[PDB]
Amino acid sequence: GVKTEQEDVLAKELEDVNKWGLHVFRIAELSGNRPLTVIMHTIFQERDLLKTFKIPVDTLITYLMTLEDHYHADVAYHNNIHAADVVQSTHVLLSTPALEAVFTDLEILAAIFASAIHDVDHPGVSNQFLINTNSELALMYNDSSVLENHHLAVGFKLLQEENCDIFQNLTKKQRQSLRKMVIDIVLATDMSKHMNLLADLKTMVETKKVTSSGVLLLDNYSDRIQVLQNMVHCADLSNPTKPLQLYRQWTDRIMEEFFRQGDRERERGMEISPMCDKHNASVEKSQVGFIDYIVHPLWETWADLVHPDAQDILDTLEDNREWYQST
Ligand SMILES: [Zn+2]
Ligand SMILES: [Zn+2]
């Protein structure tokens, strides 16, 4: 009834689950490529979610393993490790001092569950690739948020497998609310929604209230959900805010995925996508452009929302930006 030594090494690593920069790749190794399962399990226990929602533990484990298995091991970036990272990063963002006591258990469950399923069954190519190849998925979703609609459908559909319904003891009311929030959050991970989300984040920063001091004031669904949406979007785009040794690993993986799509595009004479082209790519330049135009405006705005909880994260982003720039 005692951990093996590998399990103990895993356990000591997981003591960092509440911190930006967990070594998720080491956890992936220690766990036998189960970073999503062990990290979700640790977080659910940590937040008392099993008791609060009467989730039987074997059901939670069975579902997590099933969820994890529907991420593609042969996809370099959009895989279970990325899902685990986004989960644990959303987990840390949820605990930010400026959001203390703001969100309900159900909203907390929604953000974490949405994080876990948000890229499930990703084929490792983009929406545009899927649309252009006349793929079955693109036709099912009428070319609209193709992957993101698919991630949701898979994530929910998997609750129907044997002993997988982790929401079996929630009331209809809890389930309908949970489901809508999860759907709103995941659909918001589509980059084509990025400009609007950021616009609304800013507007809320311009017009933000604080009550009892410190903590933010969110008094309608629109505001509560848009903050959750931006939170997970932030976790999804958190690679450049992480210590450089992690960030570079993510960048290697995303570039491996992009070039591979570039290869497949040429294996069919398709026009080559924005910097998916091996040979004609500057990884350093693309990262700088990515940070200046997308990641920094997002996180800078987030940092303002929860000032100054996010100062260390923003500083790390800027350091990494200068680092890449120095090339
Ligand atoms: Zn995605
Ligand atoms: Zn993602």
Cα separation values, 194 from 66, 68, 212, 242, 318, Å? 30, 27, 32, 21, 21
Q: Consult the annotation and say whether 82 binds a ligand.
A: yes
Q: Is the Cβ–Cβ distance between 47 and 108 less than 8 Å?
A: yes
For residue 116, the ligand closest to its alpha carbon is 2
For residue 189, the ligand closest to its alpha carbon is 1
> From the CA of 14, how far away is ligand 2's center (Å)?
22
If DSSP codes are grouped into helix, strand and coil, which group holds residue 210?
A: strand
**Angle, CA of 142, 113 and 144, to the nearest 5°:** 10
- Neighbouring CB atoms inside 10 A of 293's CB total 10
Which residue type is seen at 13? E
> From the CA of 20, how far away is ligand 1's center (Å)?
21
Q: Consult the annotation and say whether 239 binds a ligand.
A: yes
Which residue type is seen at 223? D
Cα separation values, 56 from 2, 36, 51, 113, 138, Å? 22, 18, 9, 16, 36
23 is catalytic: no
Given resolution (angstroms): 2.1
Resolved by: X-ray
> From the CA of 115, how far away is ligand 2's center (Å)?
8
Question: Which residues, in sequence order, are CB contacts of 28 under 8 Å at separation 6+?
Answer: 34, 35, 80, 81, 84
Domain count, the chain: 1
Q: Residue 284 has which token pair? A: 């350093």
Domain range enclosing 250: 1-327
> From the CA of 24, how far away is ligand 1's center (Å)?
19
Q: Consult the annotation and say whether 70 binds a ligand.
A: no
Q: Is the Cβ–Cβ distance between 60 and 44 less than 8 Å?
A: yes
Angle, in degrees to the nearest 10, between helices 221-236 and 105-117: 40
Q: What is the CATH number of the domain that holds 62?
A: 1.10.1300.10
CA-CA distance, 116 to 120, in Å (whole number)? Answer: 8
CA-CA distance, 167 to 59, in Å (whole number)? Answer: 9
